[PDB]
């Protein structure tokens, strides 16, 4: 057991660097490639990847190349579905709670252990509806945190993340109501999904700005699976700043 940092590149190449202090964007990349993400942990814990089809895969860091060199392709280690990409990387304690979801507005709470699939083809973790995509997984820091969902149409819904049932896999249960045919057409969908503590969100769309303190977020609180509250002009969000005590 020794501290490691796993570094993922834009082209899907990985390596395991010794220590937690490395300059990951400053590493050597192959021509046309560059930094995407880094996670940290211990050499005796798995690193997990989630692909664009909702499958998860675990790799033992001891099998990965070191910081020197340009890494090695994930396609040499994982059996990805045709056209799938590796979009997300996690390294957490076995029992760490996570929020998994699709942009059709369905999801579930699980633990990191539920993502750990050491076989080459990994595990079907989240089932995606027609033309749906995986949301970025969210590490749940406190069980009493609030889930905040914002749709492509500009509706917002907030409720305690404990309200969302825990599962080990599947489609999940409804987070926010988005009509399924509309989602399959790409006409609406879950655009942003957060787990927040007394947080404030500042959201920009071009030169328009809205600031939502706890007072304002109380106003979009509602029951899980409701359609949420429409905010005029809250479409094509391009900047979000979350200040979370």
User: Resolution in A, one decimal?
Assistant: 1.7
- Method in brief: X-ray
Provide φ and ψ at 103, rounded to 5°.
-75, 0
Per domain, the residue ranges of the chain are 1-245
Dihedral in degrees, nearest 10, Cα atoms 177, 181, 187, 189:
40
The number of CA neighbours under 13 Å toward the Cβ of 172 is 29
Sheet with 35-42, strands from edge to edge, namely 35-42, 3-9, 13-18, 72-73
Give yes or no for a contact between 102 and 167, defined as CB atoms under 8 angstroms apart: no
d(CA 175, CA 197): 18
Residues in a beta bridge with 171: none
Question: Minimal CA–CA distance to 170: which of 139, 128, 134, 119?
Answer: 128
Give yes or no for a contact between 212 and 201, defined as CB atoms under 8 angstroms apart: yes
Instruction: State in Å, rounded, how far the first CA of the chain is from the last one.
Output: 33
What residues contact 146, with CB distance under 8 A and at least 6 apart? 158, 159, 160, 161, 195, 196, 197, 199, 217, 221
The alpha carbons of the chain give a radius of gyration, in whole angstroms, of 19
What residues contact 211, with CB distance under 8 A and at least 6 apart? 200, 201, 202
């Amino acid at each position: 057991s020794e501290p490691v940092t796993i570094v993922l590149s834009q082209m899907g190449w990985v390596r395991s660097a010794k220590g937690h202090d490395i300059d990951a964007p400053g590493l050597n990349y192959k021509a046309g490639d560059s930094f995407k993400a880094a996670v940290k942990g211990k050499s005796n814990q798995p690193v997990v990847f989630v692909d664009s089809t909702g499958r998860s895969y675990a790799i033992d860091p001891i099998t990965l190349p070191s910081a020197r060199g340009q890494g090695e392709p994930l396609t040499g280690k994982l059996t990805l579905p045709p056209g799938a990409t590796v979009d997300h990387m996690l390294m957490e304690s076995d029992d760490q709670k996570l929020l998994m979801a699709s942009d059709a507005g369905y999801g579930f709470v699980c633990t990191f252990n539920d993502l750990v699939a050491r076989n080459r083809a990994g595990k079907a973790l989240i089932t995606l509806p027609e033309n749906a995509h995986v949301m970025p997984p969210v590490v749940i820091e406190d069980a009493s945190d609030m889930l905040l969902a914002i749709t492509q149409a500009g509706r917002m819904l907030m409720f305690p993340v404990s309200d969302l049932p825990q599962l080990s896999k599947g489609k999940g249960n409804k987070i926010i109501n988005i009509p399924s045919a509309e989602a399959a057409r790409g006409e609406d969908g879950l655009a942003q999904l957060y787990v927040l503590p007394q947080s404030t969100l500042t959201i920009h769309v071009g030169k328009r700005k809205i600031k939502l303190r706890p007072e304002e977020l109380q106003k979009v609180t509602g029951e899980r699976g409701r359609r949420g509250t429409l905010m005029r002009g809250l479409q094509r969000i391009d900047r979000v700043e979350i200040d979370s005590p």
